[PDB]
């Protein structure tokens, strides 16, 4: 009966909040002060949380799921009843964890040695990522691109084939058709009177939104190709694809390292307020106190006053071994801490606004039950953090926060320099993200057999992304598995939808703050009505369907690409005038070796 | 490490009458199945403990409460406020209260 499930969850909601607390408090003491008497302090305290949750999970199947009427207590029950693994045979369950540990340690400890000196050998993160991000030598970028895929990616090919079979068995025992349908279960919504969403409906909404970005991406692809021919003459065709090893990093995920070759007006400095911070003696604490004044300006609460003692805003005065990585912690019981090692720079002035945005999202849904204290889907949590960073990087906000000469002149040449640096990171990553999840979805359902994995991968690079390989690759390579998110078992569609939600939030908040100009000049400071539009979504958590959360801000029930294109229309107008003598589009027949 | 000595009751058959008190420790029975004094599904111990810890956000830290309740049965009198005694100004027509 349904009233027994309510009494089940309230014993759960008070044993979990304490056991999650000290399992996360011990993870704080390891992260900010590393010993090994802290790693053993967090492994036993971490396993008491994991052993407790599988005990309550096997108690949750005593209650049926379709004999429930209240939507909230049904949502908590389905998130706890989830079997996930453990549906496999107990010798297949240990084979899967052996593969996931072997693929993870090949990626982090794989070395590449030089053919002129076999005694010098580079790892990926120090040394191989620096060549792909800084070099202008064609022959050295071609060496680092091919040798990472032929010496490390060939080890992951027999391991990734066994990984697909075991993950499809686990997904079909949980009544999905494949493992790709299991990943799309985040966006599913069942029976809330007009707000429903199918797991197959996500596939059409991604492909419908993508064919409206292809006019903008084609003009960006044509402008970068014309600028790369001056940097690498006799290597690039003026009507063809771009070679895969000249894109700024190892995989071509972000084009953000191509800015020094593709800058529109290099005689205008892109605005940088780092010298005005060290001329006014701003400490470590000023960067967060101006960040807290931004959020109280819009109508959001202060920091919790436990935030100021418990947090560790710099690396300590001790030479203290403590993972230095910006992050926002939500230990529980209303205890919010930020861990970062901040330097006096406009870079960490902006990520301070980003990391505080995770905190203000966390402080808002802290009145829901324990199992609904996440973002409404996997994409909302990063998207609310980046609309705080866009509003703080504008020169309108910088001159009113005291950091820009009240006699500063923004010219139309510097807005093109700023918008093109945004499009190399935002627009340049959207066909990479769409192509990769489309390839992984077709591998799991079996539309691509294993004798055509690397054949269909490079046909989709030339057609969707416009990127050609420099050396042909047969079915002994596995080039997707040489990325971190593929070999470490992560979903990748959250980076596509976060980019679309980010400009839907920003365009909906700037109509409430009564903006008049272009969308990229907007700032939501001093408003109250925009914050009330934002706070009505922030407090929902997972208690409502995410389509119901979007109408509280945007006014629509689906993700939309038209606010993303309105942000880049000053660039799209300027790009169509720079490509009057160029060719827009590419040919899938040209190759850098096929002459 | 958590002060686990401060408990509260989280299951009862029926809400309390005003100023009523209940220190029993019988195993609660949520479902219809009888409990027979042992724990299990739908048979819960009725007391939980605040695990208080010094690094808790406000609203999670312990507050001490005192409830004063003045009652007036039908006696002849009892305790009350203090008093303010003025001064004696002898040698002048005065308005006095002794
Ligand atoms: C890292 O934290 C641990 C524990 O928080 C520190 O180790 C000991 O902590 C106790 C407190 O319970 C002290 O009485 C001991 O003196 C600490 N050990 C030592 C060797 O000092 C540890 O000190 C912290 N790390 C550093 C570098 O201070
Ligand atoms: C079941 O649904 C009802 C409404 O559909 C929820 O009722 C609300 O409960 C809160 C506190 O529990 C009250 O403050 C509200 O006034 C109630 N609303 C109404 C309309 O009466 C109820 O909370 C849900 N059950 C659970 C366990 O959350
Ligand atoms: C979870 O996996 C189990 C198999 O281990 C599935 O079958 C359940 O088996 C248990 C006994 O171990 C029964 O109590 C359940 O009734 C069975 N399933 C149900 C509730 O029909 C079970 O179907 C899986 N649960 C999910 C999430 O589908
Ligand atoms: C920035 O604004 C100036 C001012 O309008 C633009 O200069 C004009 O450019 C057009 C097209 O080349 C000419 O027909 C006008 O005669 C120019 N104006 C003047 C006063 O000379 C300039 O092109 C703009 N730059 C960008 C990048 O948009
Ligand atoms: C936006 O908010 C800021 C912060 O309160 C306002 O800045 C104040 O501006 C006045 C006059 O411009 C100064 O006298 C104050 O010293 C400023 N306050 C601070 C804390 O620096 C700003 O005026 C607001 N914008 C509008 C349009 O009202
Ligand atoms: C936030 O804190 C400041 C001082 O730190 C205070 O003046 C302000 O009133 C606080 N905000 C609210 C809503 O009380």
PDB file of C-alpha atoms in Angstrom, chain A residues 373-464:
ATOM      1  CA  UNK A 373      18.574  17.284  -4.598  1.00  0.00           C
ATOM      2  CA  UNK A 374      20.160  17.333  -8.053  1.00  0.00           C
ATOM      3  CA  UNK A 375      19.652  19.425 -11.145  1.00  0.00           C
ATOM      4  CA  UNK A 376      16.494  18.784 -13.116  1.00  0.00           C
ATOM      5  CA  UNK A 377      18.518  16.947 -15.722  1.00  0.00           C
ATOM      6  CA  UNK A 378      22.243  16.409 -16.106  1.00  0.00           C
ATOM      7  CA  UNK A 379      22.635  19.548 -18.192  1.00  0.00           C
ATOM      8  CA  UNK A 380      21.065  22.233 -16.027  1.00  0.00           C
ATOM      9  CA  UNK A 381      23.754  22.278 -13.365  1.00  0.00           C
ATOM     10  CA  UNK A 382      26.604  23.530 -15.534  1.00  0.00           C
ATOM     11  CA  UNK A 383      24.319  25.828 -17.520  1.00  0.00           C
ATOM     12  CA  UNK A 384      23.324  27.900 -14.498  1.00  0.00           C
ATOM     13  CA  UNK A 385      26.986  28.278 -13.625  1.00  0.00           C
ATOM     14  CA  UNK A 386      27.985  29.732 -16.985  1.00  0.00           C
ATOM     15  CA  UNK A 387      25.309  32.416 -17.287  1.00  0.00           C
ATOM     16  CA  UNK A 388      26.855  33.900 -14.156  1.00  0.00           C
ATOM     17  CA  UNK A 389      30.210  34.008 -15.948  1.00  0.00           C
ATOM     18  CA  UNK A 390      28.846  35.557 -19.157  1.00  0.00           C
ATOM     19  CA  UNK A 391      27.200  38.424 -17.271  1.00  0.00           C
ATOM     20  CA  UNK A 392      30.376  39.219 -15.300  1.00  0.00           C
ATOM     21  CA  UNK A 393      32.766  39.308 -18.282  1.00  0.00           C
ATOM     22  CA  UNK A 394      30.970  42.167 -20.018  1.00  0.00           C
ATOM     23  CA  UNK A 395      32.660  45.592 -20.106  1.00  0.00           C
ATOM     24  CA  UNK A 396      29.392  47.144 -18.907  1.00  0.00           C
ATOM     25  CA  UNK A 397      29.724  45.185 -15.653  1.00  0.00           C
ATOM     26  CA  UNK A 398      33.473  45.775 -15.304  1.00  0.00           C
ATOM     27  CA  UNK A 399      33.276  49.570 -15.458  1.00  0.00           C
ATOM     28  CA  UNK A 400      30.537  49.701 -12.804  1.00  0.00           C
ATOM     29  CA  UNK A 401      32.342  47.309 -10.461  1.00  0.00           C
ATOM     30  CA  UNK A 402      35.424  49.531 -10.574  1.00  0.00           C
ATOM     31  CA  UNK A 403      37.960  48.034 -12.974  1.00  0.00           C
ATOM     32  CA  UNK A 404      37.662  50.030 -16.196  1.00  0.00           C
ATOM     33  CA  UNK A 405      38.483  53.662 -16.959  1.00  0.00           C
ATOM     34  CA  UNK A 406      35.214  55.600 -16.920  1.00  0.00           C
ATOM     35  CA  UNK A 407      36.523  56.940 -20.245  1.00  0.00           C
ATOM     36  CA  UNK A 408      36.673  53.578 -22.014  1.00  0.00           C
ATOM     37  CA  UNK A 409      35.463  53.256 -25.601  1.00  0.00           C
ATOM     38  CA  UNK A 410      34.165  49.923 -26.874  1.00  0.00           C
ATOM     39  CA  UNK A 411      34.584  49.885 -30.647  1.00  0.00           C
ATOM     40  CA  UNK A 412      32.935  47.530 -33.113  1.00  0.00           C
ATOM     41  CA  UNK A 413      36.319  45.949 -33.939  1.00  0.00           C
ATOM     42  CA  UNK A 414      36.760  44.578 -30.402  1.00  0.00           C
ATOM     43  CA  UNK A 415      33.282  43.028 -30.311  1.00  0.00           C
ATOM     44  CA  UNK A 416      34.245  40.903 -33.318  1.00  0.00           C
ATOM     45  CA  UNK A 417      37.450  39.850 -31.533  1.00  0.00           C
ATOM     46  CA  UNK A 418      35.402  38.837 -28.491  1.00  0.00           C
ATOM     47  CA  UNK A 419      32.639  37.025 -30.388  1.00  0.00           C
ATOM     48  CA  UNK A 420      35.054  34.998 -32.512  1.00  0.00           C
ATOM     49  CA  UNK A 421      36.883  33.796 -29.401  1.00  0.00           C
ATOM     50  CA  UNK A 422      33.515  32.622 -28.068  1.00  0.00           C
ATOM     51  CA  UNK A 423      32.552  30.833 -31.286  1.00  0.00           C
ATOM     52  CA  UNK A 424      35.784  28.822 -31.374  1.00  0.00           C
ATOM     53  CA  UNK A 425      34.765  27.238 -28.052  1.00  0.00           C
ATOM     54  CA  UNK A 426      30.950  27.227 -28.251  1.00  0.00           C
ATOM     55  CA  UNK A 427      30.152  26.652 -31.922  1.00  0.00           C
ATOM     56  CA  UNK A 428      33.318  24.680 -32.703  1.00  0.00           C
ATOM     57  CA  UNK A 429      32.452  21.949 -30.189  1.00  0.00           C
ATOM     58  CA  UNK A 430      28.836  21.367 -31.269  1.00  0.00           C
ATOM     59  CA  UNK A 431      29.431  19.194 -34.395  1.00  0.00           C
ATOM     60  CA  UNK A 432      32.090  17.242 -32.481  1.00  0.00           C
ATOM     61  CA  UNK A 433      29.657  16.482 -29.649  1.00  0.00           C
ATOM     62  CA  UNK A 434      26.783  15.590 -31.977  1.00  0.00           C
ATOM     63  CA  UNK A 435      28.890  13.266 -34.146  1.00  0.00           C
ATOM     64  CA  UNK A 436      30.403  11.381 -31.211  1.00  0.00           C
ATOM     65  CA  UNK A 437      27.148  10.534 -29.446  1.00  0.00           C
ATOM     66  CA  UNK A 438      25.562   9.610 -32.777  1.00  0.00           C
ATOM     67  CA  UNK A 439      28.393   7.144 -33.389  1.00  0.00           C
ATOM     68  CA  UNK A 440      28.139   5.649 -29.899  1.00  0.00           C
ATOM     69  CA  UNK A 441      24.354   5.296 -30.115  1.00  0.00           C
ATOM     70  CA  UNK A 442      24.589   3.354 -33.383  1.00  0.00           C
ATOM     71  CA  UNK A 443      27.308   1.077 -31.986  1.00  0.00           C
ATOM     72  CA  UNK A 444      25.207   0.048 -28.976  1.00  0.00           C
ATOM     73  CA  UNK A 445      22.030  -0.733 -30.927  1.00  0.00           C
ATOM     74  CA  UNK A 446      23.998  -2.591 -33.590  1.00  0.00           C
ATOM     75  CA  UNK A 447      23.561  -0.430 -36.680  1.00  0.00           C
ATOM     76  CA  UNK A 448      27.362  -0.485 -37.036  1.00  0.00           C
ATOM     77  CA  UNK A 449      28.886  -3.993 -36.924  1.00  0.00           C
ATOM     78  CA  UNK A 450      32.376  -4.374 -35.539  1.00  0.00           C
ATOM     79  CA  UNK A 451      34.022  -4.751 -38.958  1.00  0.00           C
ATOM     80  CA  UNK A 452      32.918  -1.192 -39.811  1.00  0.00           C
ATOM     81  CA  UNK A 453      33.584   0.783 -36.607  1.00  0.00           C
ATOM     82  CA  UNK A 454      36.529   2.765 -37.965  1.00  0.00           C
ATOM     83  CA  UNK A 455      35.045   2.920 -41.453  1.00  0.00           C
ATOM     84  CA  UNK A 456      31.858   4.624 -40.272  1.00  0.00           C
ATOM     85  CA  UNK A 457      33.744   6.837 -37.803  1.00  0.00           C
ATOM     86  CA  UNK A 458      35.792   8.631 -40.456  1.00  0.00           C
ATOM     87  CA  UNK A 459      32.897   8.897 -42.894  1.00  0.00           C
ATOM     88  CA  UNK A 460      30.968  10.785 -40.218  1.00  0.00           C
ATOM     89  CA  UNK A 461      33.948  13.083 -39.585  1.00  0.00           C
ATOM     90  CA  UNK A 462      34.070  14.222 -43.209  1.00  0.00           C
ATOM     91  CA  UNK A 463      30.314  14.633 -43.585  1.00  0.00           C
ATOM     92  CA  UNK A 464      29.205  16.179 -40.270  1.00  0.00           C
TER      93      UNK A 464
END
